[PDB]
Predict the structure of Amuc_1100.
Amino acid sequence: SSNEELEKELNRYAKAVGSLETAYKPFLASSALVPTTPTAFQNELKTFRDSLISSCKKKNILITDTSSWLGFQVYSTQAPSVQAASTLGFELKAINSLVNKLAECGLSKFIKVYRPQLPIETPANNEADQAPWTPMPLEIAFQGDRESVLKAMNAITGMQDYLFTVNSIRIRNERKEQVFVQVSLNLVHFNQPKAQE
């Protein structure tokens, strides 16, 4: 009975992955969820923030305190829910990878890493079909010259570990010659099988 339940789920997942364009193969591994307590998540968050601040210091990149929390400042003191820690750990790993790639582009300032909350964080405003993948939105803002902005676009596009799609870019006066960039993105999380104890 619980055997057939698991069999149904595993065959559902197998068909879900199979229906994907084989171009998504390099992105599938990192979508696997790692068991994570809320505290383990908070620790990984604070370590990533320390590494990022240190790296930006070494590279002469200014980074606001809100940016350095990688879109997860709400969990700097309050731990996330037990149900959401895995998924947040995925999104945190992805954003950490993305921001470090951007840190290699010769930018001059990281201004904002804004991350709308995912459904699983809020049970409040919520056994059929599961989507093959789900988007996770975020918006980043940074400042740099044109050379670095083009490098940043390419850095996002060339990523092989996490799939971020670029929904829009806006260029404004600064907040060589500096420009202020705001990028609206979706992180793609590929559907995972679930199995209760």
About this structure: The longest strand covers residues 133-144.
